[PDB]
Design a protein around this ligand. Structure first.
Ligand SMILES: Nc1ncnc2[nH]cnc12
Lengths: 195, 187
C-alpha cells in the first residue's frame, strides 16, 4: 500500500486539490482519503496566525513513501510566464542578512518542466534578479524535514506573481486558478501509483 | 479553443466530476468552466432515460467539438467486474451507432433500454444503460463526435441496484478520474 503525503503551505494552495477527492478530517485534525492500494493524506502548514511555525512538521510525519509539496511561487525572472506549473530540481534557503545559503536536491516529477526554487522567510517584492527563478517560503523547510525520515520529496510550484510590489495583486486575485493548476498536476501522479 | 460537452443523467453520477473544477452555474443543471484553450460544459439531465435526453438535448446544442456521456451502467455478463470504468465502441437500442473510444480505457459495447434491466445474463449483452443511444443520436444531428464513459455499477439481476446505491460515491469518483485527464488532453 502506497502512502502519499501532500503538503501545502496554506489553505488557498490546498483548496482545489482538497476538492478532487472525497477527503475526510481524521481525529488527528488532518485530511485523509484512501482507495485501492493508495493512502492520500493532506497537511496544511499555516491555517492560523501570521506565520508558520517549526512544529508544523516537527517531528516530521513518519511512514509515508513520498511527500509532495505543492504551492505557489513568485517568479523573479521575467522569462518565467505566470500560471505555469514546474517541478523543482533543487531548493535553496537564503538568509538575506548574511547571504548564507543551504541547498538540497529534490526529486523531479515526470513530464513537468524543471526549475530551481529559493525559499525565503519574508515575501519577496524587491524586484527581478539575475540568479533567481522561483521563490517561495516553505519549500526548503519541507525538503529538509523529509530528509529526517529518509522519505523522497518532490515539489510542484505554480508561478503566481512577479516578485514586485505591483505584481502582488495578481496573486491576490487568482488564488482559485493557481490552486487549480496544482490540483491538475497532482492527479497524474496519484494515478501512476494505483496498482 | 476546444469545446467539450459532458452529459450526466443524474446529479449523483455527476457529483464528483463537478468537484473537479470551479464551475459556474449558468442555469439549472448547466455548469461551465474555461481556461484559454478549453471550454468545458456539463449538462445534468432533469430525469432519466430517453425522456430526459429529449427534454435536455432537443434541439441538440451546436458548436462543441466533442460530447462525452458519462454514467453508471449495468453489467449483463458475469465476466464484467463491477467498479470498472469502460469506454464504449458501439451502442444499440435493445428494443446501432459507432461511438468514439476514449484512449487508455477498457473497451465495451453498450445497450440502451427504456426500463431498469434485471433479466439476468441470458443475452449477448455487455453494459446496459438508459441514455447513451439517445445521446449518440442527438450528437449525430449536429455532426459532433460522441464518446462515452460507463462504469459498471450493478449486475443486471434482481436487487442488483443495492451495489450501486452502496457505492455511489466510489462510482461517481471513478467517472471523475476518467474525465479529469480528458480535459488535460486539450491543453
Ligand atoms: N441495470 C441497469 N439497467 C439499465 N440501466 C442501468 N444503469 C445502471 N444500471 C442499469
Amino acid at each position: 500500500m502506497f502512502k502519499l503525503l501532500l503538503i501545502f503551505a496554506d489553505p488557498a494552495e490546498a483548496a482545489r486539490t482538497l476538492s478532487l477527492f472525497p477527503f475526510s478530517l481524521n481525529k488527528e485534525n488532518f485530511y485523509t482519503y484512501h482507495t485501492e492500494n493508495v493512502l492520500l493524506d493532506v497537511m496544511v502548514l499555516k491555517t492560523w496566525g501570521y506565520r508558520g511555525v517549526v512544529q508544523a512538521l516537527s517531528p516530521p510525519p513518519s511512514g509515508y513513501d513520498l511527500w509532495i509539496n505543492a504551492g505557489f511561487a513568485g517568479a523573479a525572472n521575467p522569462n518565467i510566464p505566470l500560471l505555469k506549473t514546474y517541478t523543482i530540481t533543487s531548493v535553496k534557503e537564503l538568509t538575506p542578512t548574511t547571504s548564507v545559503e543551504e541547498e538540497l536536491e529534490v526529486t523531479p516529477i515526470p513530464r513537468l518542466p524543471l526549475a530551481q526554487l529559493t525559499s525565503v522567510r519574508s515575501p519577496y517584492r524587491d524586484g527581478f534578479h539575475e540568479h533567481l527563478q522561483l521563490v517561495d517560503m516553505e519549500g526548503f523547510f519541507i525538503a529538509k524535514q523529509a530528509s529526517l525520515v529518509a522519505c523522497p520529496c518532490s515539489m510542484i510550484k505554480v508561478s503566481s506573481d512577479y516578485t514586485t510590489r505591483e505584481g502582488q495583486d495578481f496573486l491576490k486575485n487568482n488564488k482559485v486558478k493557481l490552486s487549480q493548476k496544482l490540483a491538475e498536476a497532482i492527479f497524474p501522479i496519484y494515478s501512476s501509483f494505483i496498482d
